């Protein structure tokens, strides 16, 4: 998949394309509707399926620092767009271009001159142009004759509107199961593993892996979650008995340094230290709220209940296999 | 009007004076009673009307950093005192003088030796001298024969005690209309305009003017307010279609950087950038609480409702002309 | 009393000992049970009474920064252990030794090889060894024949479990009287006196003494407390009319710098400045919550009520003489 | 004078203009040549004289936080342009437009489509387009028949090149005299006065006025300077015996602090005043001495009085040398 | 290769091993001598070749925050050890064990009880036990009949001692050529690429990739270097015309910042790419120039193009000198 | 000895006094001349001997945060005054009083009204009143018939002026020997011991005691020094084999840190102790060496043992030179 930053980087000789346009944060199930319709129409005409997306977040342009939390990083947005069949992602920066343009000159510049679009697919909530004048309906009439528009209704399921906003609320409440349901997959973060408290190995109280994330990253509420940890493909040696590319059962502690968040993973039944490696942490279910501990004994007792509840939740998760990992490790008991 | 810092700076040959004494933060309506009585008595005897005030706040002397928020800056206190007819402001620093003095030596030093007072006017709440022993009644008896004392009751109106404390509470609650009612004018701040998000001009989402204030400045609760923005007299060029010395209608956003406050002003129906200029922002009415925004579209929709409610509130404000500005700009519609 | 850091510092020729083992934070009344039983048994056999304690807190080993607040400093733990008759304190660092050891090799190494114990006394809550496997009951069976174990039930009195946890909660709620009841003495802090607001002396609003404490120190809730201030033995000159080694009546203000705490002491009926000195502040009773002040007059009025309520509470405290100081100063009135 | 942010804010209405293009930092004497040639030509035709300038600094686009010190603020650049008779300032941001563009499209878009220019005036060092491709020659050729292009060599005078670079050098060495000579006026900063040490009254050692500036502002090397302080027009009362819009003789201490920040402290000669809250302009005339540490009050005051004597002399020369002195001023010969 | 943290994590299972003991920071050419002697001996017997190393740095135990700069990270030390055929790395923390211990107990515990060693290999400078009592001799005597002890002199070559110290010196002076000569390979750092100035596209001045490193990482003196940049294996898409696992010719700017942090900015020659989010390895070949300030865009680009010419030359020599060049690479002779 | 803050705290009761007036920072040998002349005169009459000193430092009133380094704390100034027999210390704050005052009112208010002085003793450099107007002469004339005024020249000895300035210079150069010679005693700091690296036990490299001091405290140049450490009187238990109120031979490392702060680390010779929580006085005798970086444990300990040898020698000389040595001390000749 190609990745272009700004209109000027798009090949001048780009033949023909089917385009979808949005922030696409999270690439949730509604987003997948727009991508599917787009990939299908491109197949039909032998054209390229292009996503136009935005970075930085269009909101942060007017209100810097008060940007919505990133459900996925931009990098993951690329990876997800590829996995669903996008051939090219065009990334628009609204402080460089297309912000002051009228609806008319927007379509003309982006869809025709730049992308040579024959089809375009947007959500019902899509807007464009100076002071957001352009709507999904404007796009229908401006493009009548010139190119075909397909406007997909926002996704409603189980009485919930599925949008970036709802996914963020579910994460913020600690309800990763409902977030996952909206995403169509386990919510996850990826990141390098650093040193933390003691060393990962024989001692149960020491995390197998510690990670930090900036406060722009959306993360579930401080608490303990059941999930899966996967060391990403690597040739670097691994301390202990975990293998790369296998999703390992783990009780995951999300915390806050007293707004930079931490994620500490206790991998079930393994003795390993993942310092240096790149590690994906997928969330499945909430286990408990954060607690303060006043004795080593109390701490470990609770730690063991976390493991117990995690083993239960993960054993269920494996049964919903459209969400579960391909290769996993989960022991039936300790 | 003269401004003296400390007793030692007062002219030795100061003939005769009528004196009022207090912190005078905000110069609210109660304060204006003391000033009026003082200016009138000075007129009568052909003497000077002097205000004795305090900086730093007498409270911050014992409890530094836990000082009351400044309803007005000291500079504005001077300007307000002038506008009501004070000829001289003496500014006392309690860490330099008059804090350890007895009530007796206080009157003797300040009122006679320094200010050659023939009349003095204080509030019923006025205190003075070591450990606040001296009261308004002490001042009556210590000054019998020597000089005339006039003690004005605290101002009560519409079942509210009008004091610096009540004005601060109204501001803190976001009730600027009630604060204004207590002040006898629109609550305002003045300050240099800095660069903010994008550039002021054609785009509705970009503020016309951004300002910052230290956390000692009293400011209404985070939210959106209707008010008036006035570029203070200047010869510097102005970017866009606003003129100096005209009060322009504006939706005003007060925020907090995550305790240094910001004030962002969306001037109605104007395209301007005020970087570099000194700008007064007067508050009239609360519009709404602060909200987080998840789309450019939602942001602008709300922005436009703010404008709508502002136009309404300001059109009413103009009718109460004792509070409204002399020269204003408010369009009947967009 | 000897103080040893780590097993390696204990004399190789240490003859024979009676040992107690725990964190001992606060050395509360439950702790005193373990120490008493230990000192008594050591007397009986002519051996040394040893305390094994832990620093850093065993909890902070797994969860750094999320350590329990220190009811006493380590230094005070030493002083308290001495005052109750401990001959030697061995201080174990769990990041250096004894954390990965099995219950069996723990007893063998610590109690026999290092300390040559003939008796050991632990609480019912005591645990030891890798992943806290070892219990008070494990210690009974592992030591049958080899050495005598005495396991003391947790202390229950007036329907409250007396533990480090409960003392911390009482402090956190501002209930120092209940904390004191659990401690078996007045809760106290010691520390150097620094400059604060103005100078200690004639002015009532200026603190006699200002101190700061790091956020690892347990301290009662922000508020005003009645207590006693004692300048620790010294030959340095004292500004004003306070003598060393006398407990002076004081209204004590605990605050927070906006997590480093402050303690400001208004010594009743004395004019003194304690800059430079080391000062113990004992807490007796809660007086009031913290308030914001908007006038010097209001501030001092409240200050005087604090003094009034303090004089009352302290006059009662003196009557409970097992808790009260040996030499005190409290005036019947101003 | 108008100020437009971006090509899009320029009136479609504009039918004819004489344009000059540069950063114009400092608006020094070389800069004045460009503006003069532009303004006089604009008055010849019936056209408006337009300055195209850049903010953020083009260097900062590539090397953020490595930007050169601003000789003047953007605000003062506007004011200086207006003072030399520019009708419109157009401010280009390179992060928004005109940066990816080829030499060909840059000219047509900016000079023809936006500004509808008939005449252009640039320095010989002038560069434009993608990767600095376009040059003073490159410009003259693309613009045949439609645009009179006047290229002006960089200003050499007394064997010294007068550039923003050269000015920044003079400032940094603390040689304000040469900086002024190159600028055509006294170098100055403007800012609100805040509280400092004590209160401006009878005591010499407490500064009449305190100011702080961001690390972004070019200021002379730490030291003491002779200068003039002016309270900018205001109806706000003044504490002490000073008036607005009079340049007062002052000894000026420039200092630094951990927090970045630079400070400017002004001891005004023969006045007892405290300027807290006013906007004041501080003009620099000559270097007096380097910074030094003090360990007694008497020694500090001894030096302070020597700074005052030196300022009296140097400022008396500035008044006599006429050309750069202020219109209305206050200076005493003796204390 | 296994990695054990502390003696306690070592398998009880281990019956025979050839051991080497050192900090091994940089795994330079002297270090390679120790490892080679160890690995070949281990293959002779039926034994595993074990490296005993230390983290935190032994110096940092006594002088916290005064620790020497890491020539490589602990992670890269592992990877380098594995590349020279070590079977297990045992990592000692001196704050947890082996620090109070006498020479006698140190050997028996570590070499006999834990590792069940038959053979030992150490540098002649090797020190152990309480207060550095144990030495290369001290070691040979305690271990009679059970342990073959091979002591190897420090590597001298071309009249230069090759040590971690010497490498840190070369790096600090910006002499990466000599650092590489001493290491036996190109010095490198590895890290995730983040956002910087603009976007990696057609414009030369915006870096292909930005990286930051803690003050803990030894890096060359601030300046421009010739080097190779490699995108580490990945299925993540690449923006632009670059592939993973190809070393691309790059000019590399090393800089600093208040906040500690060092930066590494890579301008890859003849590619339009933005590497945000990838892990990249940056190899250093030769010093090009010291850092300098710029005050015009044209001058910066003028210098940038000179850096590119210089890189082409220096990298062409590195390719020809064969021995240290990468396996698969991309370099153009002309622009 | 009494300590009064401000003229207002002085007893109205005080009927007669001999007064000395100065900053007295360091209470050096020049200072001792003033105090001796004052104390002996006070014992002659029936009067109390009073020191008028200043806090904050008079310089800091004008130049905040540019204050000279405190040779001693205000607390130690009190203690030193008491040790030379002053009966009352009166502490003037110039931000509260005596600063606006003329020479005439300063004398009458302070010396007559407040202190009811009969006799005054000042240094020849002494300055008072508004803008340093009043001087040693100015003082003698205003005080005829009521005040015996004894002016004492600044102390010159071995061709060296002994002043606070001179002491601060010696300290800053790391020449504590000359600082001590000028002070009349070992320069010292006092402070609570906190945790540092490891635990004070058998291992030489972990300091017996760690201390930090604000940037306000004059300390010797970073380096190693010979000195004596004393645990101040206490009933708190001591970990290790050290007693309170014995000066123990120590090698002392003075260092710095980003965060401002200076550190003092004491390696006490031939003791295994950890002093956490105690107040300790650290006396400086002689400079041993400048600071240096280390890259091996063995080298650090090699140097550490050389510091100890050097300390043994230098401290043996200090004991023999008698005059400045402590009363009760502990020093061993051999390890």
From Swiss-Prot, chains A, B, C:
Protein origin, superkingdom: Bacteria
pH dependence: With magnesium ions the highest turnover of riboflavin is observed between pH 6 and 7.5, while that of FAD is between 7.0 and 9.0. With zinc ions a steady increase in riboflavin turnover is observed between pH 4.5 and 10, while FAD is the major product at pH 7.0 and decreases rapidly above pH 8.0.
Xref: Pfam families: FAD_syn, Flavokinase
InterPro entries, per the entry: FAD_synthase, Riboflavin_kinase, Riboflavin_kinase_bac, Riboflavin_kinase_bac/euk, Riboflavin_kinase_dom_sf, Rossmann-like_a/b/a_fold
Gene Ontology biological process: FAD biosynthetic process; FMN biosynthetic process; riboflavin biosynthetic process
Official protein name in the record: Bifunctional riboflavin kinase/FMN adenylyltransferase
Record key words, sorted: ATP-binding, FAD, Flavoprotein, FMN, Kinase, Multifunctional enzyme, Nucleotide-binding, Nucleotidyltransferase, Transferase
EC number, as in UniProt: 2.7.1.26, 2.7.7.2
NCBIfam families the UniProt entry points to: PRK05627.1-3 (NF004160), ribF (TIGR00083)
Family according to the record: Belongs to the RibF family.
Taxonomy of the source species: Bacteria, Bacillati, Actinomycetota, Actinomycetes, Mycobacteriales
Function, as annotated: Catalyzes the phosphorylation of riboflavin to FMN followed by the adenylation of FMN to FAD.
Activity regulation, short description: Higher divalent cation concentrations lead to decrease in the turnover of riboflavin and the 5'-phosphotransferase activity, while the adenylyltransferase activity increases.
Known catalytic reactions: riboflavin + ATP = FMN + ADP + H(+); FMN + ATP + H(+) = FAD + diphosphate
Cofactor(s) for this UniProt protein: a divalent metal cation
Record-linked PANTHER family: RIBOFLAVIN KINASE, RIBOFLAVIN KINASE/FMN ADENYLYLTRANSFERASE
CDD domains for this protein: FAD_synthetase_N
An annotated Gene Ontology molecular function: riboflavin kinase activity
Pathway the protein contributes to: Cofactor biosynthesis; FAD biosynthesis; FAD from FMN: step 1/1; Cofactor biosynthesis; FMN biosynthesis; FMN from riboflavin (ATP route): step 1/1
């Amino acid at each position: 998949m190609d990745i272009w930053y700004g209109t000027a980087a798009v090949p001048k000789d780009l033949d023909n394309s089917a385009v979808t346009i949005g922030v696409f944060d999270g690439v949730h199930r509604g987003h997948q509707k727009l991508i599917n319709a787009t990939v299908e129409k491109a197949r039909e005409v032998g054209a390229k399926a292009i996503m136009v997306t935005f970075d930085p977040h269009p909101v942060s342009v007017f209100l810097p620092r008060e940007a919505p939390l990133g459900i996925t990083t931009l990098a993951e947005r690329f990876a997800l767009a590829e996995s669903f069949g996008i051939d090219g992602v065009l990334v628009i920066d609204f402080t460089r271009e297309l912000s002051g343009t009228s609806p008319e000159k927007y379509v003309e510049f982006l869809l025709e001159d730049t992308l040579h679009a024959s089809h375009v697919v947007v959500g019902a909530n899509f807007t464009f142009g100076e002071n957001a004048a352009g709507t999904a309906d404007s796009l229908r009439q401006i493009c009548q004759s010139r190119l075909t528009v397909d406007v997909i209704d926002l996704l409603d399921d189980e009485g919930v509107r599925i949008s970036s906003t709802t996914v963020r609320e579910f994460l913020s409440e600690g309800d990763v199961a409902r977030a996952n349901w909206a995403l169509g997959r386990h919510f996850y973060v990826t990141g390098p593993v650093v040193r933390g408290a003691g060393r990962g190995g024989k001692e149960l109280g020491f995390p197998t892996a510690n990670q930090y994330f900036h406060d722009t990253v959306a993360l579930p509420a401080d608490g303990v979650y059941a999930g899966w940890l996967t060391i990403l493909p690597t040739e670097a040696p691994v301390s202990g008995n975990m293998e790369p590319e296998v999703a390992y059962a783990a009780a995951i502690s999300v915390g806050t340094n007293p707004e930079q968040r931490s994620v500490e993973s206790f991998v079930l039944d393994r003795d390993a230290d993942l310092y240096g490696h790149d590690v994906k942490v997928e969330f499945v279910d909430h286990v408990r709220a954060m607690e303060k501990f006043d004795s080593v004994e109390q701490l470990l007792e609770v730690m063991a209940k976390d493991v117990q509840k995690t083993r239960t939740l993960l054993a269920q998760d494996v049964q919903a296999h459209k969400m579960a990992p391909e290769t996993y490790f989960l022991q039936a008991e300790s």
